C-alpha cells in the first residue's frame, strides 16, 4: 500500500483530520513546518524548509508528497507554485504536488472557470489568491473572507459559519460556476454538501481537494467515502 506524505503548516506535523474521513483505508504520514501565522511574513519564515520536509517524507517511504497549504504555495504567484513543485520532485524523485495545484485541478475537474471565493484569510492573501487564479486562466468573482491569521483559530470555525460564508460569496456573484473555499486549516467536510445542495454549484475546498489530488497522484484510483461533494462523488 502506497503511503501518501504531507507537509503541513503546524509544528506538530499531524495528518490533517479530513484524511481519516475521506479515505479511512489509506495511510497518510505528515511532517510539520511550524508556520507562525497565515501571512506572507509567516510563509517567508518556513518556505525554505519545504524541500527538506519533502526529503524526510521520501526517506519514510512516501510514494507521493503534497505541500498541504494553499497560501504557502500561491502567495508568490503561479510560477513559484510550479518551481517549488519541481524542486520537491528533484529532491525526492517522487511525484510531488501542492494544495494550490490541488484546487486548480479540482476546479477544472468540475468545469469551474468563474469562481466565487470564500476564504479564511486577510486581504493581502486574498489578493494573492485572486492573482494566482487569474494567472491560471480562472476568473475570480465574488469574495467573502474571515480575516484569520492564526492556524488554531481556523480549526475553530464551525460548519454553519462556513456554509454561510460560501452562500454570501456566491450571492455576491450568482452567475459564477462554483466556489473555492480556501484554507486547509478549515474543517469543511460537513459544509461542502450543504452548500452544493443549496446552491446547485460545486465547491472546491482546500483540505479535501489536497487529499483528492494527492490520492490522484498516487495513481491507484482510490475513491473517497460518499457525501463530501461533487469533487469526490463524480467518479
Ligand atoms: O491552506 C492555507 O492557505 C493555510 C493553512 C493550511 C493548513 C493549516 C492551516 C492553514
UniProtKB/Swiss-Prot annotation:
It catalyses: 2-aryl-2-methylmalonate + H(+) = 2-arylpropionate + CO2. It comes from the Bacteria. Its EC number is 4.1.1.76. The keyword Disulfide bond does not apply. Pfam families: Amdase. InterPro entries: Iso_Racemase_Enz_sf (IPR053714), MaiA/AMDase (IPR026286), RibuloseP-bd_barrel (IPR011060). Disulfide bonds: none annotated. Keywords: Decarboxylase, Lyase. The keyword Lyase applies. GO terms for molecular function: arylmalonate decarboxylase activity. This is Arylmalonate decarboxylase. It comes from Bordetella bronchiseptica (Alcaligenes bronchisepticus).
